[PDB]
Structures are given as structure tokens and as C-alpha cells.
Write a protein that binds this ligand. Structure first.
Ligand SMILES: O=C(CCC(=O)N[C@@H]1O[C@H](CO)[C@H](O)[C@H](O)[C@H]1O)NCc1cn([C@H]2CO[C@H]3[C@@H]2OC[C@@H]3n2cc(CNC(=O)CCC(=O)N[C@@H]3O[C@H](CO)[C@H](O)[C@H](O)[C@H]3O)nn2)nn1
Ligand SMILES: O=C(CCC(=O)N[C@@H]1O[C@H](CO)[C@H](O)[C@H](O)[C@H]1O)NCc1cn([C@H]2CO[C@H]3[C@@H]2OC[C@@H]3n2cc(CNC(=O)CCC(=O)N[C@@H]3O[C@H](CO)[C@H](O)[C@H](O)[C@H]3O)nn2)nn1
Ligand SMILES: O=C(CCC(=O)N[C@@H]1O[C@H](CO)[C@H](O)[C@H](O)[C@H]1O)NCc1cn([C@H]2CO[C@H]3[C@@H]2OC[C@@H]3n2cc(CNC(=O)CCC(=O)N[C@@H]3O[C@H](CO)[C@H](O)[C@H](O)[C@H]3O)nn2)nn1
Ligand SMILES: O=C(CCC(=O)N[C@@H]1O[C@H](CO)[C@H](O)[C@H](O)[C@H]1O)NCc1cn([C@H]2CO[C@H]3[C@@H]2OC[C@@H]3n2cc(CNC(=O)CCC(=O)N[C@@H]3O[C@H](CO)[C@H](O)[C@H](O)[C@H]3O)nn2)nn1
Ligand SMILES: [Ca+2]
Ligand SMILES: [Ca+2]
Ligand SMILES: [Ca+2]
Ligand SMILES: [Mn+2]
Ligand SMILES: [Mn+2]
Ligand SMILES: [Mn+2]
Lengths: 232, 232, 232, 232
């Protein structure tokens, strides 16, 4: 089998294993800060630099994967704590959408909320234009920030959040477990056919955005990943 | 919400938080050893002593859970490396089946392979009587060691194996990710309705067994768990 | 710290983690075959596709690394069993030298034997033009196939050879242990300053070559690697 | 060429291939447990029972060696996690020092920290009396627990640690690569003249110790070794 495996306990500028897009910076403590607090419609994204072959047009086989990551969102004075973080999967050529308005697009979609990606969003602002639920939520996204499914959640300012994601290729199930600061777990799961929605070669990563009035600290603290694709 | 949370980095026999059944021992290094290498049809099981409420007859709500554990199976001289370990969920009064033959029953079922439990098995011996696949496998079990579903796997002697399990109550999906020695990940997922198959209060644990000619070292190294049941 | 880790138990065409250069083919059993047995001056090379940051111009720190691989060289009828395999480190833009004569150049150097690379060679033909010792040898190469140091060795046709390499950044020591078919070990070690000889970002890989009369089967069976760079 | 080669995937009490010294026990899972958790100044050691000819008095030749082993250190309640494990080389008659205080001596030296041995220590307690660095470390020891050289390291409780050691006789270089749980590699290398510091035949092994307050689980899980001495 063909396996991609990596582990990030911290990050650094100049690591060729990571692609930095837009307003991303690396802090002295090793955290990735995705948005620029002094910029309007800030968008920042980090991708694992090596494309991952999630399915093969030759065999028809689809990869399974296990990934864990930790993040932190923290309020800043005067601005609305917005807009959130999205763990996403997209074609290997993926770039921040041209003329991105940031905000509710989470740096992955156009103004209408459409894009070419699969993702798990940690949404901290209710955008009526994307049919967002009224509270903070975890959502499963398939080519749109108008989520296929959401679950109520609570983004606590300054809290370290732990996420575990399992994609089971045979059932096409994307399962997510979110470990909150109050000790409770939040789960969400959805059948998503990655072979039907995405090309063979993809990139994995994180994106976050803000607006003129909606800004917060978006931090990626750690990321581990393993994908395995059965080969002929 | 109602949350049960625990973490075992090590295990000890004086700790009332675990119930010990059958031939199980705790080694001085802190590991749980489920079977006795010198006994015919050895069966050893371990359960978290406190019953966990997984669903409510009042609200109809079912808990979600995230659990991770690590185990090790190691070959012993002159014996077939058998039979395997099962992570299981059973009614709170669960006991080793009376007159257990161990072996392919994995200490949770009768001779016909039937029992009252939901489990994830790490099977290392092909029992034709339980329609086992020809190789080592991970199976999702619902009241039978004749698995609802299996996935090929490889039990590497002396390797530390890491497992992550997500149960998403809304989709009723039990998703499993197993991290092997060769670096590959193996996943298996199955829709299992816990309300329909198990009582409101259950015990979680591990079981392993052997036969006259089938024996191996079965070890539980660590276990973390979090369940959350919505009470509104 | 910044760590790069990978493990290849087998190889496949289409794996984005591997760059194929020249006459390389992947066999149905998963082995990489580096040279074409029917081509004059055949050269084949495989590289890990991601550039590896081996030193930082910001901190002055140099990475340490541990790598293991298994290869096989097998005689073919009538041709001289030549020329061997080189495990090498080179600038990220590395290509087979233009107008390569293959042969004693091992696909990494020009006709005079000069190139931009650091390598461990498994040399099976004595090239007087590169001051080769009279027998098969393991050599440490610094920008030349005229080795800084060599040790007598024996390339056994059809034998699986295991190699372990340690690069200790603090002492700048490259240490090699070669495990033969007859059970004996061969070692060679050399102080090589990678920060002085190579750029910050590099590619790691394997190269092999042949000539008109010098041809043999050159196989790469497995490859594991871990590098760690202290960050500040 | 005179070669010594062995492989231990597990260990057993009834095997004359290993010499057991002091408080050492074999657990039912096959691991060697070096210290007794209920004893003051506990010292336990294991040696490969056959002496290894590391050098010739006839030719003046010195052996090269390649060795790999895996170990585990685990914290125990109410005791300081101390003192660590040493992989050592000593005269064939080597015994635990008479009236050993255990602790910082690592079971290989006297109260002043002096002994007759060459070793690689995995030291988890800072002994100012042996000029230990302030954190956990890997050290290269020559007749003293006051290390010739150290490198900062981190002993993770319950983690399986893999070590690879290369001794290159021509450069007299002892190179060590330590693979941690967080994925990082730690290396240390030192020129050590084995012919000048040790006798013709030596014993290879492992030692660990504790004190009244400093105690932890010290486990040896596996050990492979190959040495080759050129006889021509
Ligand atoms: O000061 C106070 C009271 C302070 C306070 O805490 N008061 C508390 O009151 C309590 C009881 O109420 C208690 O008494 C308590 O003791 C007391 O302390 N209010 C007055 C007040 C404060 N802002 C803030 C909050 O919301 C406004 C303003 O600052 C940011 C935000 N904005 C509004 C706008 C206007 N553009 C637009 O609507 C067009 C574009 C637009 O909305 N894009 C969206 O902007 C979002 C962010 O708002 C997202 O990023 C979206 O994704 C993005 O699409 N752009 N940015 N607006 N009005
Ligand atoms: O020696 C060799 C070849 C060894 C070898 O390495 N050969 C190598 O081959 C190489 C090339 O291939 C090379 O040539 C190499 O040079 C050469 O060394 N075979 C001859 C041989 C060896 N056993 C072993 C393996 O299987 C047998 C025997 O030892 C264990 C097992 N059992 C079972 C019994 C007693 N029954 C019963 O209890 C009957 C009921 C029964 O089968 N319950 C099941 O028993 C299982 C375990 O077998 C499971 O636990 C099941 O869950 C359980 O239901 N009693 N024993 N049986 N026959
Ligand atoms: O048949 C036998 C004895 C066989 C045998 O088993 N004899 C046994 O002896 C026993 C007792 O000892 C018993 O009596 C037994 O009964 C008897 O059977 N020799 C007569 C004989 C055989 N070739 C062979 C070996 O070497 C020659 C020939 O086949 C291959 C090679 N090449 C080379 C060429 C074309 N040049 C060039 O390309 C010139 C440039 C050149 O030399 N580049 C180098 O070529 C190398 C490869 O040779 C390397 O690849 C170098 O890196 C490369 O730089 N074209 N060919 N040349 N002459
Ligand atoms: O409880 C606490 C804080 C616990 C804690 O978690 N605090 C947390 O702090 C957090 C924020 O920081 C939070 O606030 C949190 O809420 C709070 O819980 N300290 C008070 C405290 C605890 N021991 C421990 C640690 O060190 C002592 C004690 O237990 C073991 C050790 N020993 C030693 C002895 C007996 N001597 C001798 O034998 C003298 C000779 C001696 O020192 N040979 C050396 O002993 C070593 C081992 O200590 C090595 O083995 C050396 O190789 C050996 O040479 N007898 N005992 N000594 N003093
Ligand atoms: Ca939103
Ligand atoms: Ca040559
Ligand atoms: Ca110490
Ligand atoms: Mn949303
Ligand atoms: Mn050469
Ligand atoms: Mn020390």
C-alpha cells in the first residue's frame, strides 16, 4: 500500500513540507497564525506541500485517512470574533479564490459560497447568506460553505480545541470528534464520496478568514496525518 | 450534557475503577495481560467499573463517544498466535460466558458465536465456524463473532498498535482507525444502532482468549475515553 | 523541532512522493529497477519528491538523520556486472548530468567524475579514471566519484543488502553500516560538512548506471528516513 | 572475518544465552524489567552470555558493530522517575559494583562515578555529583557516568524508544540515533578507542538503577546485534 504520514508538534517558516498562502505567519512559539489582525478581508491558508493521491483511476480504490489537529481562536478588542477555521481538501492546484472577500467564505469559496473542496469548518459567525445555523457550529462542507450538515458547538476564546477525523474509504464516511474546553465531546459524520467530488491528487490544509469588522486570532498548534491507499 | 471521561496511561490491580474477569493479570510494567499462557481455553476480560449511560428511555437521545487505546499481541514458542482481542460494549451485568471454550469466541460469545455485545475485534485466527476471512482482520461485531463487517489487517508480533474509535450518535456510525507497525492505517466503519442493540447502561472493556493449541500474549497498554449524552 | 519522516515498504508508479529520472521502472513486486538492461549507458534515479531542509541560514543549525534501505544487484548473462548504486544528497533541482556516459559516473557526475552531491556508493566495477580501489567497495563521495574514502566490500549477485546510515549534525559524521548475505557487517564513516557542501534545501535518492558492456539488475526494495532539525 | 550475530524479539528466564544480574526479571510478556520497584538502590543488569572478541592481539584489528534495541521507561506513582538505562560494554568478568548505591551510578560505576565500561546512557535524573546536564539526556560514557559528551533528550513515560548504534572501527566513531515518540530523531557521536579502553573479549548488555526516592519501570523489549572483526 501507498502511505503518506506526517507529524507537526510545531511549525516553522522555511519548512518546504508546508505551503503558505496569503496572510499566514509563524509565531515564535511555533504556532501558525492564519489571519492578519490589521488587514480587511484577511485570508490565510496552510497546505501540506506534497500532493496526496486519495484515489486511483486505474484501480478505482480510494484512500482511508486518520488525522488529528489542535487549534485556538482568541477574541481581539473592538472587532467581532469572526469568521472561523476550516480543515479542507482540494485539488493540488488550489489557491485562495481570486478577489476573495474572506469573511464567511472561510478563504475557500467565492462570494456565493461555492468552491471546489471538501472540508470540516469551525464556524464562529452566523452568515444568513450561507444559511448558517444561529449559533457557533461544526459543519461538513462539500463544494460550499452552505454546509451539507452542521452540529451546534461553542468556540471558547483562548481555549485549545482538539479534533480527530476519520475517513473510511469503504463506507465513504467522514467522521469528526471535537474535544471542547468544558470536557464534552462533539461529533459529526457524513457520507462524502471523495472519488466523485475531488481529483485523484489533492492537497490538505487549513484556512481562516476575517472581514472589515470581523477579526480574531486563528491559530494552528499541531497536526498529525496518515493516509493509506491500497495499490494494484 | 452528561459526560463520562477517563484516561489510563497505566493500570493497577488495587484501583477499583476497573473490574477484572477470568485469567487476566496486571504486569509490574503496568500493562493488562488478558490471557494465561499456561492455561487451556484461557479467557481474560477487563471492564471500566462504572456503568456508562449511552442512551435514554426518557428523551430517546443516544450518546456520542471518542475512545483511543493501545495494545500489543506477541507470539509465543510452540503455539499458534491466537485468538485475538475484542474492544466491547455489553450490558452492565456482563460475565464471561458459562463454560466458555475461549478460542474464536474471543471470550464474549457462546460456542455458536452468539452473545449480547457490540465490539471491534482484532482477530488473529481464521475460524471457519464463525465465517472468518482467510487472513488477520479487524471486524465490527453485533451480538456475534460472525462479524457484520471485516477488513484485512496484519497482527505484527511485538508491535504496539494504536486504535481510535468514533461513535457518532446522529448517523449511528461506529468508525475505527488502526495504526499499524509498517506505517499504514486501516479503517472500518459500520452503522450500528446502540439503542436497538444494547441497554441504556453499559460497560466498556476488552476481552481476549486462547485454546489448547492457540495461545499468544494479549496486552492492553493504555485507554482514554469520552462520551457525551445530550440531556435536553 | 522540524522533522521529515517517511517509510517505503514497496514502490508504485504514480506515487507523488517519488520523482523518477531516466531509465527507472517499478516492477510488479513493488521493487524499483534503476537501469534498463537493453540500453547503452543506462542511467536511472529515484528521489524523494519533497525538498528536505537540511540546514538553516537563519539559525546555523544542521539536521541529523537516520535512514535505512535495502537493495539488490543481480548479474545478467554475458554483460559485466556493473556499475553499482549510489545513495545520494543533492541540490533540489538535481537532474541526471547532461550527456551522461553512465558507467563509473553512477549517474551523478560528469565524464571527469565531478558533480554537486554527497553520497554513499556501492561500487561493483573498478574505474582507474576515478582512482577506484581494485575490488568491490563502499565509498563516501563528496562532489566526486573519486571517493573521499572507501572500504573493501563484496557485491553478491542476487543477495538482499541492508544499509543503515546515521548523520550526526554536531560532529558532522556520516556513519554507514552494510549488512551482507553471509551475516558480516561492513562499516565506513567520514566527517562531511553538509552545510558547507550542500544548499539549505536538498533532495535525497538513489542512482545507478551501466555502460555498453557493463550491465546488471539494480533494485531498490525498501527505504525509511527520519531527519530532525532543531528550530529557533 | 569473525562475526557475532544475534536477534532477540523477546526474552525468557530459562535461556542460558543471557546473564541476569541483580534485581532483573523477565515479565510474562517477554520484556526484561531491569529494576525492582519495591527495593531501595535497586540495580539490575542483563548481558549477552557469550564474550565478543572486539579486538585482536595478533593483528591489532578492531571490530565494527551495528546494534539496535528498543526500550521503555514508565513513571510509577509517588517516586521520582529515575535513574535511567545504560547500554554498556565491559570486561567479561563484569559484575554489579560491590555495595552499589544504584541511583546515578546506573549500576555500572562506584559512588565516585568511576567504572570499567563504555556505554550509551539514557539518563532521566540530573546528578550534580556526576556533572549531569540540567535535563534528560543521552550520554556517551567512557569508564565514568561523568559523560564524555551528552545531548538533550526527553524520556516520555510509557513510550517505546528505538535506538540504533554504529561503531566504525577505522575512525573509532561510536554513532547513536534515538527515535522518540513525537517522531523526532536525536543523535550523538563520539570518537572512543575501544581497543585502548576495553580488553580483547567483552560483554555487551543493559543496566538500570534506582534509589530510595527515585524509581521507575525500566524495560528492554528487543535487541539485535552484529559485530565483525577482520581476521586477515
Ligand atoms: O459598543 C456596544 C456595546 C458593547 C457591549 O459589550 N455592551 C454590553 O451590552 C450588554 C447588553 O447588550 C450588557 O449591558 C453589557 O454589560 C455591556 O457591556 N454596542 C455598539 C456596537 C458595537 N458594535 C460592533 C459589533 O458589531 C459591529 C460593530 O463592530 C463590528 C461589527 N460591524 C458591523 C459592520 C457593518 N457592516 C456590515 O454589516 C456589512 C458587511 C458585513 O456585515 N460583513 C460581515 O461582518 C461579520 C462581522 O461582523 C463577519 O465577518 C461576516 O462574515 C461578514 O460577512 N461591520 N462591522 N456594533 N454596535
Ligand atoms: O512443524 C511444522 C512446520 C514448522 C515450520 O516452521 N516449517 C518450516 O517450513 C519452511 C517452509 O514452509 C521451511 O521448510 C523450514 O525449514 C521449516 O522449518 N508443521 C507441522 C505442524 C505444526 N503444527 C502446529 C500448528 O497448528 C497446531 C500445531 O500446534 C498448534 C496447533 N494445535 C492444535 C492442537 C489441538 N487441537 C485442538 O484443540 C482442536 C480444536 C481446534 O483446532 N481449536 C482451534 O485452535 C486454534 C489454534 O490452532 C484457535 O485457537 C481456534 O480458535 C480454535 O478453535 N494441537 N496443536 N501442526 N502441524
Ligand atoms: O570469455 C572469457 C572468459 C570467460 C570464462 O568464464 N572463462 C573461464 O575461465 C576459467 C578459468 O579462469 C575456466 O578455464 C573456464 O573453463 C572458462 O570458461 N574471456 C574473454 C572475454 C570476455 N570479455 C567480456 C568481459 O569484459 C568485456 C566483455 O564483455 C563485457 C566487456 N565489454 C566492454 C565492451 C565495450 N567496451 C567499451 O564500451 C569501452 C569503454 C569501457 O571499457 N567502458 C567501461 O565498461 C565497464 C564494463 O566492462 C564499466 O561499465 C565501466 O564503468 C565503463 O567505463 N564490450 N565488452 N572480454 N573478454
Ligand atoms: O508534592 C509536591 C508537588 C506535587 C505537585 O504535583 N504539585 C503541583 O504543582 C502545580 C504547579 O507547579 C499545581 O499547583 C498543582 O495543583 C500541584 O499539585 N512537592 C513536594 C515534594 C514532593 N517531593 C518528592 C520529589 O522528590 C522527593 C520526593 O519524592 C521522591 C524524592 N525523595 C527522595 C527521598 C530520599 N532522599 C534521599 O534518598 C537522599 C539522597 C538522594 O537525593 N538521592 C538521589 O535520589 C534521586 C531521586 O530523587 C535519584 O535517584 C538520584 O540518583 C539519587 O542520588 N525522599 N523522597 N519532594 N517534595
Ligand atoms: Ca459563518
Ligand atoms: Ca566504479
Ligand atoms: Ca543521572
Ligand atoms: Mn457555517
Ligand atoms: Mn568507486
Ligand atoms: Mn548522565
Amino acid at each position: 500500500a501507498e502511505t503518506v504520514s506526517f507529524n507537526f508538534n510545531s511549525f516553522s517558516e522555511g519548512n518546504p513540507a508546508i505551503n503558505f498562502q496569503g496572510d499566514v505567519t509563524v509565531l515564535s512559539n511555533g504556532n501558525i497564525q492564519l489571519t492578519n489582525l490589521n488587514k480587511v478581508n484577511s485570508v490565510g491558508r496552510v497546505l501540506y506541500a506534497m500532493p496526496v493521491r486519495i484515489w486511483s483511476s486505474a484501480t478505482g480504490n480510494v484512500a482511508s485517512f486518520l488525522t488529528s489537529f489542535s487549534f485556538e481562536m482568541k477574541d481581539i478588542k473592538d472587532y467581532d470574533p469572526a469568521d472561523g477555521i476550516i480543515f479542507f481538501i482540494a485539488p493540488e492546484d488550489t489557491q485562495i479564490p481570486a478577489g476573495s472577500i474572506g469573511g464567511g467564505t472561510l478563504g475557500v469559496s467565492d462570494t456565493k459560497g461555492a468552491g471546489h473542496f471538501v472540508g470540516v469548518e469551525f464556524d464562529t459567525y452566523s452568515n444568513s447568506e450561507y444559511n448558517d445555523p444561529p449559533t457557533d457550529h461544526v459543519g461538513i462542507d462539500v463544494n460550499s460553505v452552505d454546509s451539507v450538515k452542521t452540529v451546534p458547538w461553542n468556540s471558547v476564546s483562548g481555549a485549545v480545541v482538539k479534533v480527530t477525523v476519520i475517513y473510511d474509504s469503504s463506507t465513504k464516511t467522514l467522521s469528526v470528534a471535537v474535544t471542547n474546553d468544558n470536557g464534552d465531546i462533539t461529533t459529526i459524520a457524513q457520507v462524502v464520496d471523495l472519488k466523485a467530488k475531488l481529483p485523484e491528487r489533492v492537497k490538505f490544509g487549513f484556512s481562516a478568514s476575517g472581514s472589515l469588522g470581523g477579526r480574531q486570532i486563528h491559530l494552528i498548534r499541531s497536526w498529525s496525518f496518515t493516509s493509506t491507499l491500497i495499490t494494484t
